[PDB]
Amino acid sequence: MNIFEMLRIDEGLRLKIYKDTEGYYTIGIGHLLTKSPSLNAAKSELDKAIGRNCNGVITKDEAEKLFNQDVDAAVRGILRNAKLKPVYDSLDAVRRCALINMVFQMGETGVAGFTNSLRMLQQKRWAAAAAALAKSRWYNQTPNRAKRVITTFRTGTWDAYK
Ligand SMILES: [Cl-]
Ligand SMILES: [Cl-]
Ligand SMILES: [Cl-]
Residue ranges per domain, the chain? Predict the structure, then answer.
């Protein structure tokens, strides 16, 4: 199991525009297009990203290209982040995937605000970290996903995805 497989399970693959779980226009494997309510903006956002006139529909290969860039963007953001780096450096390989998962989903800034959870993870207080993470809007909005990520952090294994 790896990060890509891990995220493909959590996000799915959709080749046509879509509203995410919060109104948002998205496509591919969790590629946020826009927070604006304009299909039009999303539609335009899609074209600028693919580089072509997509008319709100993309191909697998295209969705995969976008996914490759997003994961890279996620890892590099963590590594540039004064808040996230130390946490990341301190973790084993599995749990690191979990951190990447979260950043992909909510942005650097979003994850950076899980102060307490972050401190706990750095201290290797797994169980405590899992409880803090659970008390979030994230958990209540996308509970099943959230739980897969939290178990991953708690256990250090890929069980939740097996
Ligand atoms: Cl927290
Ligand atoms: Cl809460
Ligand atoms: Cl979910």
Answer: 1-162
